[PDB]
Symmetry: C2
Subunit: 404 residues, 2 copies
């Protein structure tokens, strides 16, 4: 069995060239449809063309390089837009991996026939509308976004596209008869891969998410003259309630469950005033839908129990944008695991993705999978960038070969 061979110098050169579009100190500033982002997309489309793909920036700003080869296709990609404080490998890694994998599989006689498409989905980070590109590709609803989405400066997405020259450009869309699998390589800086000192992660599931505000309504009072016994301190209620959350969630959790109080506000927030109101922001995530729902039910029950006992009233508010867990395709995961075991024996693991990605959108329509490399100024050692691409290329060869 002959396997393809990536060119590690070519891979790193392209990653560093993409970094130069928007490089700002230790990171990259490249917001969707900004002039520097469009510049990077034109460069990327040229590189896809150089590789022999049919490439263009589409009507929403996605860069898509379609194979010219017949038969079933594997799509490899990620995003190349950033947040205001982006790093040089978030998103860029999987886009350039996809390009190099397309090149390497085309250069190996045994894999030369395999169709590989490469994608940079526009606006994964949501400068205008989160996952605009992957939503557009799979045919999810985008009409509201195209009509009324704005960025931080209030610039309409529709106006941004016209300014980028994309106003009358067709959008690339999924062809379910042709495109049969999706692979998204991505960094992980969060820590699980790093904390395990492993080099390769095979993603099992992209976690679901819940967000809530929890409000506490008590009574303002003078902090000096009001005896402790008659107080209705909303901030004291809030702090006590967090311990109830930790207890109930700890009973339901496994080692991967996460939950976070990201914000606490006391009103009025003065030394000499017992707070009459208080609010916390709560997020939690888990890969297991039963557990995620049981955590929500436990939180609802905690609020009802609290309100049956205490003078400070508790009020739970669901935030828009809850997400369910999204599993990665089991057979694709196993191709990734076989490649990881072949090329990184003893240095790979299965793990959930604690963050959201375009793959969570695409996976609901075609088989999808993700491959993680660790990140430690976001960064990854060059030899680990190379190893990640070697594993991804080997798996891609096997995945694409299996489609026939």
């Amino acid at each position: 069995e002959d396997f393809p061979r990536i060119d590690p110098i070519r891979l790193l050169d392209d990653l560093k060239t993409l970094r130069s579009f928007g490089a700002t100190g230790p990171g990259v500033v490249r917001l969707s449809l900004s002039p520097v982002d469009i510049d990077a997309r034109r460069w990327l489309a040229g590189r896809m063309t150089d590789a022999g793909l049919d490439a263009a920036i589409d009507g929403v700003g996605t860069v898509f390089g379609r194979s010219r080869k017949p038969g079933p296709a594997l799509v490899i990609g990620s995003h190349s837009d950033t947040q205001p404080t982006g790093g040089w490998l978030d998103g860029a890694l999987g886009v350039i991996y996809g390009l190099e994998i397309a090149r390497a599989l085309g250069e190996c006689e045994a894999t030369r026939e395999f169709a590989v498409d490469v994608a940079s989905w526009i606006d994964e980070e949501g400068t205008f509308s989160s996952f605009l590109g992957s939503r557009s590709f799979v045919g999810d609803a985008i009409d509201d976004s195209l009509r009324s989405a704005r960025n931080h400066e209030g610039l309409l997405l529709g106006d941004a596209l016209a300014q980028a020259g994309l106003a009358n450009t067709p959008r690339v869309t999924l062809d379910r008869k042709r495109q049969r699998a999706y692979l998204e390589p991505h960094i992980e800086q969060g820590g699980r891969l790093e904390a395990s000192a492993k080099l390769i992660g095979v993603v099992t599931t992209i976690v679901g998410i819940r967000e809530f505000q929890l409000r506490f309504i008590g009574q303002r009072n003078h902090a000096g003259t009001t005896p402790m016994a008659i107080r209705r301190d909303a901030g004291a209620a809030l702090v006590a309630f967090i311990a109830h959350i930790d207890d109930a969630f700890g009973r339901l959790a496994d080692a991967d469950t996460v939950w976070t109080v990201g914000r606490i506000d006391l009103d009025p927030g003065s030394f000499s005033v017992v707070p009459g109101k208080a609010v916390l922001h709560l997020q939690f995530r888990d890969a297991n839908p039963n557990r995620l729902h049981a955590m929500e039910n436990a939180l609802v029950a905690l609020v009802d129990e609290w309100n049956g006992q205490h003078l400070v009233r508790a009020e739970l508010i669901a935030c828009e944008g809850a997400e369910e867990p999204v599993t990665m395709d089991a057979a694709l995961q196993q191709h990734l695991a076989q490649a990881a075991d072949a090329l990184a024996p003893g240095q790979w693991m299965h793990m959930p993705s604690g963050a959201s990605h375009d793959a969570q959108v695409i996976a609901q329509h075609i088989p999808a999978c993700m491959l993680f490399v660790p990140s430690i100024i976001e960064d990854t050692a060059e030899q680990h960038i190379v190893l990640g691409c070697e594993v991804a290329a080997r798996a891609a060869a096997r995945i694409a070969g299996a489609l026939r």
Copy 2:
């Protein structure tokens, strides 16, 4: 024994006339040395003159009406400036009580000889410099304040006094050979008097105060990708620490001890970021100096214990302006208690003052005492305003009569 008789109509008329200077909806806006405050001070000085006192607005804006009678003097007063959100009786009550008591003792043949002075100390509320008037009166340091104190608009106190016409006016100062006692009537809205459904409080001690910031230094992390086990969540440390405070302070407290977390801030305060830093503001008050110091020592010890165990570091910062408890004169308290028992039998109690007052400054130089009436839009029933003045006038007669 003949006792003086206040005129309750005259008392209420003066309280309502003073309210008209700055009346704003349900309250009063009358900041020290503002045009409306100066207007009220000119009116007040005229009323003192009408009563037969030697009255003037002094070099710092205090209104002082000095008795023309020989021998030892009782000073009765409070403040007539407000905070931006003031009520019509905070401060005003004791100023107008003092005026009416001076009038009533002068109208009774048995008390006609007794010297009674009446005061409105400037800027108890600290629009420029807290307790400026009572500090100036007792000869505490005010030179720094006169030179560099500013209000919210940055207007210098020295400039404000010149604009009020007070630039070359002598300051009234304490004469310890002549002025032998101070009585400050005041409302209490905080609740102890109200919660007990009593009508008269005899103040034992003005509580001491401590304020601290407590900072927690952990590590920022992505709230989705960072496993719970490796977190250094500064907000979780903060919340856990509050429970330690409550436990340690509860062991030291009696029913009157107070402590309050008035503010909590998590950094950065986002749903998806484990907070890397967190800060709370803590205040506590007590009438017992040993307990107040033991609470401070317990807090220091809690920080040291925390730092010997946890990954998130704790850092305690003392705030300027700590205050010690200040006892009210025991013999004056007993005159107040005798009058309260005579005129409000079964409806009075001893109690600390949980708030600061000019009396805490004056008490360090001459015998001082305070008398509280309840407050429920800050307000007090007219019959309870009248009863408070009847009790204060009877006590004043006995206090002044005892000085000879």
